[PDB]
Design a protein around this ligand. Sequence first.
Ligand SMILES: *[C@@H]1O[C@H](CO)[C@@H](O[C@@H]2O[C@H](CO)[C@@H](O[C@@H]3O[C@H](CO)[C@@H](O)[C@H](O[C@H]4O[C@H](CO)[C@@H](O)[C@H](O)[C@@H]4O)[C@@H]3O)[C@H](O)[C@H]2NC(C)=O)[C@H](O)[C@H]1NC(C)=O
Ligand SMILES: OC[C@H]1O[C@H](O[C@H]2O[C@H](CO)[C@@H](O)[C@H](O)[C@H]2O)[C@H](O)[C@@H](O)[C@@H]1O
Ligand SMILES: CCCCCCCCO[C@@H]1O[C@H](CO)[C@@H](O)[C@H](O)[C@H]1O
Ligand SMILES: CCCCCCCCO[C@@H]1O[C@H](CO)[C@@H](O)[C@H](O)[C@H]1O
Ligand SMILES: CCCCCCCCO[C@@H]1O[C@H](CO)[C@@H](O)[C@H](O)[C@H]1O
Ligand SMILES: CCCCCCCCO[C@@H]1O[C@H](CO)[C@@H](O)[C@H](O)[C@H]1O
Ligand SMILES: *C(=O)CCCCCCCCCCCCCCC
Lengths: 326, 11
Amino acid sequence: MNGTEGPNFYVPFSNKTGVVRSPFEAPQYYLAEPWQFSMLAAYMFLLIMLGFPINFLTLYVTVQHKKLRTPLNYILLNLAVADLFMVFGGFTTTLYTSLHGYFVFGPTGCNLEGFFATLGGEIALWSLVVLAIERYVVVCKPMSNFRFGENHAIMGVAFTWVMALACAAPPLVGWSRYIPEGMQCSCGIDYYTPHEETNNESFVIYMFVVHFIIPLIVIFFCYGQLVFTVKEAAAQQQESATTQKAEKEVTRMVIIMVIAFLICWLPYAGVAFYIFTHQGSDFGPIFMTIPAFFAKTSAVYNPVIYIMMNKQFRNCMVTTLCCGKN
Amino acid sequence: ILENLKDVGLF
Ligand SMILES: *[C@@H]1O[C@H](CO)[C@@H](O[C@@H]2O[C@H](CO)[C@@H](O[C@@H]3O[C@H](CO)[C@@H](O)[C@H](O[C@H]4O[C@H](CO)[C@@H](O)[C@H](O)[C@@H]4O)[C@@H]3O)[C@H](O)[C@H]2NC(C)=O)[C@H](O)[C@H]1NC(C)=O
Ligand SMILES: OC[C@H]1O[C@H](O[C@H]2O[C@H](CO)[C@@H](O)[C@H](O)[C@H]2O)[C@H](O)[C@@H](O)[C@@H]1O
Ligand SMILES: CCCCCCCCO[C@@H]1O[C@H](CO)[C@@H](O)[C@H](O)[C@H]1O
Ligand SMILES: CCCCCCCCO[C@@H]1O[C@H](CO)[C@@H](O)[C@H](O)[C@H]1O
Ligand SMILES: CCCCCCCCO[C@@H]1O[C@H](CO)[C@@H](O)[C@H](O)[C@H]1O
Ligand SMILES: CCCCCCCCO[C@@H]1O[C@H](CO)[C@@H](O)[C@H](O)[C@H]1O
Ligand SMILES: *C(=O)CCCCCCCCCCCCCCC
């Protein structure tokens, strides 16, 4: 027996010595040293210090630079708002709880932080998906006559909200649940204990299929098409040096975007899959934190990839950061 | 493609 169960929680440490306490009531210094809790706070501190300015700066330059306010940019703004839900719903809460060594806000607060942290990360994910769809549509022109405008952009944003709710909301009302996780200082979807009263198993399958596999398939198709279209245009236009460059830069971005998506979600997927296939084995607190590390850090690296590496945003950020010049 | 690529932030 590798853990300790409780009404709203599961502590990945055995209570044979009787030292385990509820993650809502007392420090968890028996499942990790105090210093590792410090390191956890240090880490959240990093993600806040990098993730706040980068994502906020994104919203700010958009207010300052008329040119950024175009429909194809809406989903990138959305992305930055989502990253901010992660930073304030999740990262700050976790900075705070980790320094107490347990989830001091209790089961209801567990639901608040789990909801907003999950909402944020899911809006982000569906943003990356919608952005790929939009790009496919605009560049690959799979629909004759179609012109992408404001209204489609809004529908793209709303779609992500809805897909995110379809993921974060259920565990608030019967299907899966939010419980503290890994080191018990932050809360997420219970994807690792069979808890029939909430139907964890099927929810995990739904997550895997609808919120990982679909996303992954849509992104590969769209960007695969996009790279194909751009290779073809270039091959038919080798007299144009610019076009040859666009093809190289675009292929490079796609590799980067796709690898980044994998790094962010594959670990959670790989771990949820394993646990599902190897029922209730000894999964330690620090091991359950690895997929979380990968997913959470995306509130920094996504804006680097999708915002800072985008010529327009970058120029506008530079102009705004240098007080108005250059 | 070029104008399209610029529009979507890829080039
Ligand atoms: C992990 O394992 C530990 C060890 O089992 C476990 O902790 C124990 O929890 C029990 C209660 O569930 C604690 O019990 C208290 O003991 C004191 C006296 O020492 C009593 O005052 C408490 O109450 C009773 O007596 C009252 C008389 O006035 C009655 O009114 C009442 O009905 C009770 O009979 C209660 O017995 C026990 O002290 C701790 N032990 C330790 C070492 O902490 C812990 O809960 C397990 N963790 C999880 C998350 O399950
Ligand atoms: O003063 C308004 C400036 O912002 C505009 O952006 C808006 O564009 C649409 C208005 O026609 C709205 O639907 C949209 O919600 C706004 O973002 C525009 O970009 C600028 O030219 C205006 O100066
Ligand atoms: C950035 C804001 C700092 C967070 C405030 C940390 C407060 C932690 O408070 C500490 O928690 C201990 C539990 O380990 C308790 O023994 C004490 O209440 C206290 O020393
Ligand atoms: C999630 C969005 C993807 C929609 C899948 C539509 C499948 C259409 O696949 C077809 O192949 C090519 C597109 O690359 C084009 O030649 C056609 O217009 C397109 O409809
Ligand atoms: C990828 C599909 C497999 C299903 C596993 C679902 C686990 C996702 O869990 C989510 O991850 C976020 C990033 O840490 C956390 O912040 C959220 O609180 C948590 O709900
Ligand atoms: C979503 C799928 C990503 C598509 C990755 C395409 C990788 C191909 O790679 C690209 O094309 C050439 C192959 O002829 C390579 O030699 C070049 O280095 C590169 O531009
Ligand atoms: C107008 O031109 C003002 C721009 C000058 C700002 C340049 C100052 C550099 C600051 C770099 C960031 C340091 C923060 C590190 C703290 C952890």
